[PDB]
Ligand binder design. Structure first.
Ligand SMILES: [Cl-]
Ligand SMILES: [Cl-]
Ligand SMILES: [Cl-]
Lengths: 196, 196, 191
């Protein structure tokens, strides 16, 4: 089966992905943005040296990279999880995170949403900073993060209404008793789904 | 007029549909799942014997059954109440009950959502389980039921944005003053709508 | 840039439209419903005399009016705000205010949703009625449905959806209106 895996930024989605790939050998885990960067660096070596250089491309060029990355991903034949985002926040508001072409090509069975308590997102973002993984203190409010998660749920349901796919919401909003518990719980739920 | 009538499983929607079917002239009340089962048995007598057997068909064959069933329904008569669901919960997540071909073929004027208080759904499911009517073993929490009702709301509005149809939300979340008041209230709001 | 601006009726959206048009010279602010009624009178003049007269028309005739109105608006050059409704409540339920052709023709960069505390909506409605009231729970429902419509259109049309939170308590009069006006100007002047 094929699932898109989503969640607000910096909340633990990467860790879930890495843990899934460590645990299940019957599974390929890919990060869409990384595949986009790699395919872009192949075609535009002069402009794209690091993942964030993707912002510099002209629209006609960026769109064709997303399509090409999706085609590359769709060559995978066993279980697949694609790490990406339901929406991005910009000054103009939220913008959908999947182009319809991406879904037409990958043909996901469903969308998985990791939903957190916004305080845990603020804290994870700051811990990632103290470990080096990001330069500036994130200043999103609990309110802004909740809004994002609500909007993401609506995007996922809309994509399901359009394309007929599962919408799997994984509740990680409860308090952790021990460290890594949210991540461990999500990984096991995804594995059990895949092996059902 | 033609309306798709929906709500979470086992909460009273079937009773509303049975009462509409007895009380309204010039109107057919029909259950999409029933037609699907009947068409499935017509075309696959070897595999389809119990209505659970639909689960064993390849998804492409199940979809073609859903098209055939919508075609049968649209031919029945002019005014229709189509009892079905916006989504059902599965091990892979919520999955839409309709396909686009359903709405294209039936051309509903709108979607009706019967919305219940989760505590009343829990009690009603257990009452019906004890009486031998409801046999959906898994017991859901209050928060599970509210999430389902929210997702159903999102599917219905998505379908309206795509197909320009009404979204009618019937609030049955207040406490009943006598047994079966919710059913009677919902029936009369629907009849009042159909004769406006 | 072009945005559709929406919110539940009677909550202050018109005031925001007026003050935007007044505080920004290079901006056109158009009310879709007004253009629709204009085109309706011009095509059905003996039948159409006030705006609620358009509910009498065959749906295909109404739709053609909606399309003609969108074409007229799509000619406006420079920044533009189109004041309209994601949905209205009817006896048959909520019904979308736009048709897909409206978005297709205007090609908005995005949708802007103004969101209010329900009791502030009730208050404003009375201050213009005195001159049947929905409950707080009705208005909340209407706002949640509008959000769902806007996100759906965003997914279908690949456009922005901006939510302007005006649910906090006003510390002085006019503060909600001023805040939304300024957030939208800030948006139109972004680089
Ligand atoms: Cl992460
Ligand atoms: Cl029932
Ligand atoms: Cl107003």
């Amino acid at each position: 089966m094929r699932f898109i895996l989503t969640g607000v930024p910096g909340a633990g989605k990467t860790t879930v992905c890495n843990k899934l790939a460590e645990k299940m050998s019957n599974l390929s885990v890919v990060n869409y943005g990384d595949v986009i960067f790699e395919e872009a660096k192949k075609l535009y070596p002069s402009i794209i040296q690091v993942r964030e250089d993707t912002r510099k491309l002209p629209r006609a060029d960026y769109r064709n990279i997303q399509i090409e990355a999706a085609k590359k991903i769709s060559l995978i034949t066993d279980n697949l999880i694609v790490d990406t985002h339901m929406s991005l926040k910009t000054p103009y508001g939220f913008y959908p995170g999947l182009i319809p072409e991406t879904i037409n090509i990958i043909q996901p069975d469903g969308i998985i949403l990791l939903e957190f308590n916004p305080r845990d997102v603020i804290a994870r973002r700051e811990k990632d900073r103290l470990a080096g993984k990001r330069v500036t203190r994130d200043m999103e409010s609990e309110t802004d993060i909740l809004l994002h998660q609500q909007v993401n749920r609506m995007f996922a349901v809309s994509y399901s209404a359009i394309n007929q796919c599962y919408v799997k919401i994984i509740d990680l909003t409860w308090p952790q008793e021990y460290e890594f518990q949210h991540t461990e719980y999500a990984v096991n739920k995804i594995i059990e789904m895949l092996n059902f």
